């Protein structure tokens, strides 16, 4: 795989109550990822760019909301979230 | 012809006609001169930035055509022209032809 795509697979971490509880109690990291990323791609990117070993990856897609600002109607973009479970105690 | 940011000018039109000052900024066709065209602005308090609201005095922009370059020698309103001296294009006074004062 190309490092160019490796460096773009991961967008940013997720901060929320569910993510905090999961990280604290099970060592699961929640990431915002590219809409077109695969589980294997995310696994490889996490291992390469964080020096940790991944056991399993779970993914889900949430559709963007339709908002009304003034008289204009718009839609936000879809988001993909990855749950990555690490081995034993890591990170 | 151009009135530059740091020039000294004299107001020829409006309620401030007959007063001189230093330009602070030029944008579009509006220029602000230090200590001229003041307004009383009523400012509402802002929670995030504090700075309890109060009455504040600040300069209001004037149309560019209402001010003119001030000539040091005669202390009189004048007009600006362009002349190529040596290898540099330079501003001059149309009244005397001397190069515009640099400040």
């Amino acid at each position: 795989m190309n490092n160019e795509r490796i460096y773009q697979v991961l967008k940013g971490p997720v901060f929320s109550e569910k993510a905090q509880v999961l990280g604290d109690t099970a060592g699961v990291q929640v990431f915002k990822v590219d809409i077109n990323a695969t589980k294997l791609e995310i696994k490889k990117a996490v291992e390469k760019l964080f020096g940790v070993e991944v056991v399993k990856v779970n993914t889900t897609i949430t559709k963007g909301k339709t908002k009304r600002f003034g008289r204009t109607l718009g839609r936000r973009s879809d988001v993909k979230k990855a749950y990555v479970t690490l081995k034993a105690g890591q990170d | 012809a151009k009135i530059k940011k740091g020039d000294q000018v004299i107001v020829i039109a409006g309620k401030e006609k007959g007063k001189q000052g230093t330009v602070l900024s030029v944008s579009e066709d509006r220029v602000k001169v230090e200590g001229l065209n003041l307004v009383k602005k009523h400012q509402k308090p802002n929670r995030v930035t504090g700075a309890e609201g109060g009455i504040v005095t600040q300069e209001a922009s004037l149309h560019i055509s209402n001010v003119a370059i001030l000539n040091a020698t005669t202390q009189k309103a004048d007009r600006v022209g362009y002349q190529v001296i040596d290898g540099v294009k330079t501003r001059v006074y149309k009244s005397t032809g001397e190069s515009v004062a640099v400040a």
């Binding site: 490092n3 160019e4 460096y7 773009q8 991961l10 967008k11 940013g12 971490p13 760019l49 | -």
Partner: protein, 60 residues
């Protein structure tokens, strides 16, 4: 930076491209974490990557 990049060879340009892409990812991580105060760095990195790509295409 364009003049400095021009003198470099293809190998050096490609190595710097990889380094800058890694730096861009790290800057994104930092901004997501919210620990970075200055934001012009991301734009600098993106434009540097574009410049390196243009120079590589020109040379090759």
């Amino acid at each position: 930076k364009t003049k400095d990049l021009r003198e470099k060879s293809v190998e050096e340009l490609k190595a710097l491209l990889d380094e800058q892409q890694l730096n861009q990812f790290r800057l994104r991580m930092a901004k997501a974490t919210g620990q970075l105060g200055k934001s012009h760095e991301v734009q600098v990195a993106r434009k540097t990557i574009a410049r390196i790509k243009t120079l590589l295409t020109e040379k090759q």
